[PDB]
Amino acid sequence: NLQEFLGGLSPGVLDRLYGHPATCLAVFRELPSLAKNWVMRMLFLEQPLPQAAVALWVKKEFSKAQEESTGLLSGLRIWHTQLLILNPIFRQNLRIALLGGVPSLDKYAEERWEVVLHFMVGSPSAAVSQDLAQLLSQAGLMKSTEPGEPPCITSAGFQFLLLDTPAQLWYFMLQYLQTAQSRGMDLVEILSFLFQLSFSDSLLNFLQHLREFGLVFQRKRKSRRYYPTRLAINQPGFIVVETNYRLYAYTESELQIALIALFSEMLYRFPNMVVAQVTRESVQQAIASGITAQQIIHFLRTRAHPVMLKQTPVLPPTITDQIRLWELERDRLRFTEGVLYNQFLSQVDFELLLAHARELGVLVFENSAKRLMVVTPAGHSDVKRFWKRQKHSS
Amino acid sequence: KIVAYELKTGGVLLHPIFNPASHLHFSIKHPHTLSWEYYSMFQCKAHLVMRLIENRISMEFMLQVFNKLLSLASTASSQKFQSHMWSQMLVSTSGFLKSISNVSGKDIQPLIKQWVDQSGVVKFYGSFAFNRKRNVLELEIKQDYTSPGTQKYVGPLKVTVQELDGSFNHTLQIEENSLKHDIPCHSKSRRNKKKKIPLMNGEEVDMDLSAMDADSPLLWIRIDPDMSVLRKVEFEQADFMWQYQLRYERDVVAQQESILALEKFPTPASRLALTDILEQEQCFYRVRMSACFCLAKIANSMVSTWTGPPAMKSLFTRMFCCKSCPNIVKTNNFMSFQSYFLQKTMPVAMALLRDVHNLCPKEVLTFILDLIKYNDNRKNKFSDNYYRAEMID
């Protein structure tokens, strides 16, 4: 979430990111319930106040809200104890932010995201863009390994595909920012634009990428002015599920049919409907590709036709249980690197060695009944030395 | 005794050649210049080297050597010629080796050259590792040959490995550049079924295999079990292997060395092992007398963990006191000669118990004083002087 993204930041980047135009307001809206009230209170105070007052300024009931809000805003570093006055820069910017100093667009965003997903899946016809392809490849959801051949889809790719559009886009933009820092694009400048949307060379490239994603559209041969789409700020279902593992989806866009075929066997395709079967073969194929039953169940539930909304639960218990059992049927091997010792002599002496590999992060599996500790070869030169020291101590 | 003396000061040189031994402060050319401790260790090393010659050339051939010497002497002892033949009553080293070579056809000149003419004992440091993939046991035996009393051994070396399929002997060739010796290991199909594990002798016993490793079949290893060299072994087993070697071995020197090596592992499984040794008649009595002192040392080391009464007290009241009165000792009947020795050695080890304050507990001192007060010896056919003297000790 955006709260996680902002919490994972340093004070030096935080105060700079608190730009005058929008950031002080976008981060304010994040404040879930009560911290808004305290920010408004001590927006006009130039004198810090004791912490005991803030502690006792919430009744005994519902105090956990007080502690959680205080911790969240301490992490955000909106104020400092100074002994709880707010940061002067944030106070000034917030005062400046508080009395101081379309139908075609949504369709465009939908179509652009749909073609992006078409390219993501193995669609022969899709929009071509080398920058988009390499960005998706380095986002961790795609791997090519051969420039001549079109890139394939990794295991995480299917999971990302089956996610809903809001979370899908949000995670995609999170990965975009994380890779922006890697490629060298300043994070603060690009981040501030997202906040400003909900109200330079790097800016131009970032806006180009956003337009490729379909969140914005200049509409004037790439002019300075832009008109953000609905997705920039941040529908009825069509699938009918039977009790015999049969799906009737009122789908005209090929994207939905492809998504359904990812985990179902298609039987018929009518102009305004398509018939598929959820069989062991298709479900286990999806599970092997990497999906888990939770994504499939959530996808079918969110794309649930209004006819089946009346029944509770919306998705039949037999279908849900069958999908879950099919996914459980498979349990899979793992991969790690390690080295094992033996002849550990005294018992109380083996317990002290277990804490050496656990603190360094090179321990995989321990055994106090046989004395059997696995150590990765990456930290083999540090565990052996410790063992030698212990032997010397005797 | 001899490895302690030879590592302490130089070494004992049987058969010197005329100084041959300059590492020690007296001359070994005459018996009246020898130190008395050197004379005692000389006789001790001489009879151990004769046991080694019996190990190479069997005991019946050895008794035939001695009978040939005695028979030459007794044919010599009846002549009247003034020493034409009376010098057959005098033995030498060359005559003894020649009589050995006459009766057996083997000469012992490497063994004589190593253990007589050379004046040193050997030190063995062993450690093992079990290779689960190739099912082998990789021993690692290194010698300390740079100490002042030591020498380098290059002969063969017997090792006895007790695995789940039984006890197997292996001969290792320990040349100068040798360090790793790979010996093969057998199955672990006596852990699949509960079957009895066969021992060094022909018998077999039920073992509790819960402490054993799941991947290794081997229960214990003994480097040079028959004491066929003049050696000091320092083997690094795991503590459960020492406990299995204390419980189920049919060799008293291995039970003694496992008692000696269990003092470094104060775990409660070792306390259970020594307590099961102490309760066990049909164990040799000098092993139980050592297990008393080992149990006292282990009990001193695991204070602030010890649960019930002090060590060996409940065991003393179970073995040697009345059933109706626990604190009154039974009247003295010393006719068993093994529970007499164990009874007179158990409070002596029990008095080495110490509390968290480093003072002997007043539960053991009161127990010893009640052993002294309630002592009645008007009924046995044996005297009480050694038992009362051990009570004062």
Swiss-Prot record, chain A:
Q: Which UniProt keywords apply?
A: DNA damage, DNA repair, Nucleus, Transcription, Transcription regulation
Pfam (any one): Tfb2
> Which cystines does this chain contain?
none
Gene Ontology terms describing biological process = DNA repair; nucleotide-excision repair; transcription by RNA polymerase II
Domain of life here? Answer: Eukaryota
Q: Does the keyword Aminoacyl-tRNA synthetase apply?
A: no
Give an example GO molecular function. double-stranded DNA binding
Q: Which family does it belong to?
A: Belongs to the TFB2 family.
- The entry's protein name is General transcription factor IIH subunit 4
UniProtKB/Swiss-Prot annotation, chain B:
Where it sits in the cell: the answer is: Nucleus
Instruction: Please give the tissue specificity annotation from the record for this chain.
Output: Expressed in all tissues tested.
Q: Which residues, if any, are the signal sequence?
A: none
Question: Other comments?
Answer: PubMed:9418870 was unable to show an association between TAF2 and TFIID.
- How is the subunit organization of this protein annotated in UniProt? Component of the TFIID basal transcription factor complex, composed of TATA-box-binding protein TBP, and a number of TBP-associated factors (TAFs), including TAF1, TAF2, TAF3, TAF4, TAF5, TAF6, TAF7, TAF8, TAF9, TAF10, TAF11, TAF12 and TAF13. Interacts with TAF2C1. Component of the TFTC-HAT complex.
The disease tied to this protein in UniProt is: Neurodevelopmental disorder with feeding difficulties, thin corpus callosum, and foot deformity: An autosomal recessive disorder characterized by impaired intellectual development, microcephaly, delayed psychomotor development, pyramidal signs, thin corpus callosum, and foot deformity.
For this chain, the family text in UniProt reads: Belongs to the TAF2 family.
Question: What name does UniProt use for this protein?
Answer: Transcription initiation factor TFIID subunit 2
Q: List the gene name.
A: TAF2
Please give the range of the full-length protein represented by this chain.
401 to 800 of 1199
